[PDB]
Amino acid sequence: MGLELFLDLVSQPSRAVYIFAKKNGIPLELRTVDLVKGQHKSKEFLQINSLGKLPTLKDGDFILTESSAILIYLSCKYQTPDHWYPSDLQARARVHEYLGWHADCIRGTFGIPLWVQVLGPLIGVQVPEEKVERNRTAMDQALQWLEDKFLGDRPFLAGQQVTLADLMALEELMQPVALGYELFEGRPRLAAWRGRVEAFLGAELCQEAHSIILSILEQAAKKTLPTPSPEAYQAMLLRIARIP
Amino acid sequence: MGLELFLDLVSQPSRAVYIFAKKNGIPLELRTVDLVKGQHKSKEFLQINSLGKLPTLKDGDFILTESSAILIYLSCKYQTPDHWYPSDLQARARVHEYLGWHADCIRGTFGIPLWVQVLGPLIGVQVPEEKVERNRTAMDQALQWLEDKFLGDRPFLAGQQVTLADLMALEELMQPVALGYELFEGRPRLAAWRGRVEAFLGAELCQEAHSIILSILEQAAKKTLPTPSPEAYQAMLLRIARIP
Secondary structure: OOOEEEEOOOOHHHHHHHHHHHHOOOOOEEEEOOOOOOHHHOHHHHOOOOOOOOOEEEEOOEEEOOHHHHHHHHHHHOOOOOOOOOOOHHHHHHHHHHHHHHHHHHOOOOOHHHHHHHHHHHOOOOOOHHHHHHHHHHHHHHHHHHHHHHHOOOOEOOEOOOOHHHHHHHHHHHHHHHOOOOOOOOOHHHHHHHHHHHHHHOHHHHHHHOOHHHHHHHHHHOOOOOOOOHHHHHHHHHHHHOOO | OOOEEEEOOOOHHHHHHHHHHHHOOOOOEEEEOOOOOOHHHOHHHHOOOOOOOOOEEEEOOEEEOOHHHHHHHHHHHOOOOOOOOOOOHHHHHHHHHHHHHHHHHHOOOOOHHHHHHHHHHHOOOOOOHHHHHHHHHHHHHHHHHHHHHHHOOOOEOOEOOOOHHHHHHHHHHHHHHHOOOOOOOOOHHHHHHHHHHHHHHOHHHHHHHOOHHHHHHHHHHOOOOOOOOHHHHHHHHHHHHOOO
């Protein structure tokens, strides 16, 4: 069974999974893969995940990827509490639905500030003023949508209780926060929901799932960051190259 | 029950759903919403989907969105064949996994040629030469990944049989094709897979699910295209504004 989980806690989807697995007490072998360094691109790793993306979960000789797939798969195999990923047609659908939008509107837009302030400069590459703004006015744009469209009156994006939908959302949101952007400033709805979740999860877990990234801006200043391999350098140039 | 499906067959996710529903014979009330025109933004529609996105499926007073959620939801409620969306842990996982990558790497990159050639100019807005190329070299970049990473030796991205994963993939891919980009040129793997699927689905269905978009380049020429509302004008400028 083994059941190892290659991941880097600077990777927002990685955190999500790690958090889920931890909160439901799932025997997991935490395989650390320095992303900043370019570990996920090491020949040895590509031998595990031809894609070289994190977090990838290896169960048996079955290697899966995609925090969504992994979570869902996990949650299933380990019959985790139902509220998480409900078996109710309407309910599950409500989850499936946000995740899809999340993948569209949240994922990839809220990680940008990290590139603009850390990973970018790390390779001498500086992001254009515009892209920066464009991106932020794009964030709150989504923040709102999330706010009143998904969150609205209820306590969670995916309904009445905590669910994969929240774990993912919040975790992704955490990044710009960690970099200094206080998105929960003028959003008591959002704020309250976050607090509600964190509350649920627990200080301990969150205090450690994050850690890595709240420090990172400093490691950045203190030049503690590893020099990325030419393989990571490439991926990094691409990502930066797809910032609108 | 009603079970209406607002959608515009120029919208690749819309096609997907429509196709699934049609192939499995699901009683569906096809609610057409001119996207090009700006229908999905009409006050009356926002009263149905605060988001104004297509295709949105209204079952009972339950309004759902996200082709993924919809499909899955559909497939469930209408106990459609298992191969589609398997109940097997490894299997389903493999689907869930692609969809996530699909949402990341395919969705949003393969619709661009339509904006560059049609929707864009339709509002006097012309896309920069770079973005164009960047985008295409980005498409085949994904095409390959899809090709040998997901497709590889097996017959489908999601395993051995047709599955939501394919319906969506192929449909999205169809756009640049319909625009004149022959992505299946130097990819016998890709080509064969497509042919495999189309085969399965049937000429009739495909012959009509597409239609709308293979014509569109013409309607474009012949100025048959509806002038978009200031609401659609906005969304159109945003979308174009997020082309890297």
